[PDB]
Design an enzyme around this catalytic site. Sequence first.
Site, PDB file in Angstrom:
ATOM      1  CE  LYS A  44      -3.910  -0.073   2.715  1.00 20.37           C
ATOM      2  NZ  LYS A  44      -4.749  -0.390   1.678  1.00 20.37           N
TER       3      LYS A  44
ATOM      4  CG  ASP B 190     -15.633   5.156   9.162  1.00 18.78           C
ATOM      5  OD1 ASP B 190     -16.578   6.232   9.207  1.00 18.78           O
ATOM      6  OD2 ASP B 190     -15.383   4.916   8.271  1.00 18.78           O
TER       7      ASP B 190
END
Lengths: 27, 48, 286
Positions: C122, C213
């Site tokens: 990433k 979240d």
Amino acid sequence: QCRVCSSHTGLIRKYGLNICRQCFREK
Amino acid sequence: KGIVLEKLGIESKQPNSAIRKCVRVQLIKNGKKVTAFVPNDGCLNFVD
Amino acid sequence: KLDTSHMRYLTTDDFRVLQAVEQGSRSHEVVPTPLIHQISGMRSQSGTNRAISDLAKLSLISKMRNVKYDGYRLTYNGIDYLALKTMLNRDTVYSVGNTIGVGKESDIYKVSDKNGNPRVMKIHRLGRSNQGANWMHLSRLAANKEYQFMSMLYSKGFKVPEPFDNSRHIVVMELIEGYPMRRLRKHKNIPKLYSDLMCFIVDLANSGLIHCDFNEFNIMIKDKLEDENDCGFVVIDFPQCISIQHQDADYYFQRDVDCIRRFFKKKLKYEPKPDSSMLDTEGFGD
RNA sequence: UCGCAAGGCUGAAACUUAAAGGAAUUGACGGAAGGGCACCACCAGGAGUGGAGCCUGCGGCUUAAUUUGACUCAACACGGGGAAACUCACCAGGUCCAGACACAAUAAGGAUUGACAGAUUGAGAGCUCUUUCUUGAUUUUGUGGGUGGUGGUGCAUGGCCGUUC
């Protein structure tokens, strides 16, 4: 174009004026 | 005048950037070992 | 946008240079001209401006000709190519590319390891890119800080994936063949996993960091085992993490009671069975 | 040498250097920000994305073909390209055609020419003149200087106006 450049991108065949979309703010 | 000891190992006190074909020599009037040099450099072929 | 194809023209002339200048641009931002040789101990004129004019087009360095404070900077590829070069240096990346995946400050770049099993490079680039005074300072350290804050429940018995290296923007996360809750169709044990959403924030209060979240992309039923489908949980729920001292937990604690009530009922018209739990237990049983 | 001491007084060489040093100054970059004043931004919300089918437009797979790039310079115009073979920058297979200028082999017994009749076809053509006959001196070829710069990419030189001011 009008002969004071080598303009190869954004070329114009429209309406005989030879002024680019990028050349409304130059030409 | 003195015998050439050998080919020389380069220790950088600047700048000529190659193995400079230099000659470890030791004299015969004294026998005190000095590093030496040849101009028109190259041609590492023609004395032992 | 992105360039990748300006790297493979070099030699050893830049390999001694990099993390000497990367720890040298941090000790001494924008570096003037006759220092690339002398930070690394590279010689003055044995293949030197040949190699710097080689580096010049490649956008990992640029000729910032200012007035006697010249610039040789290790554009945006001074982090990006050179962290690819750093993972070539820190023994993880052996070539570039089997990569598909898009975010903003997290692109999923599918790679194969030194081992042979896959993982994911990433990459962190926020502001798109906008890489400046803090944006480089963030993606250097948010690659380092989030190398430190992906193990908060792995030690404590629960499921958080593990980070591997933190080279300049790159965070390597095995690779996870996930199935998020918008991709899935059916389930075999429904009423266990609604009450385990009260109970995951129960687990999050043990470590002292409450996460919230939850959208429809979050909970990956992944592939640990492919054949027998021993799945697992990947919980992409992290960045709503709040220190509980701050005065916003009046509406974080009440989220743990009456906010998850839609998805196992509606997505999975099937009105649910089970009980629930609060977090009043987790205030004392840390 | 002087002192109980710590030290005090006198004082080198081996080696290495293109420098060490004195006072003096001009203005980039700030991790200094003021005001502007901008609704191509912010508050009040409208239109509404943000979840999806598709015109319209690309990065990715797939190619003999799924073409292509910089200017206001980049996340954009698709370059009037919504598209039919052409567009349209690429492709699956063929040939109309290259020797002039000199002299060298034949040059008008046909060298090589044409208003035509066939064979004509390579994936669909005009072209050729061995098999009517214009030919009109002229031109056929293994060749090289290179006249052929209808190879100019140009190197700037000379105004002239996109551009930079």
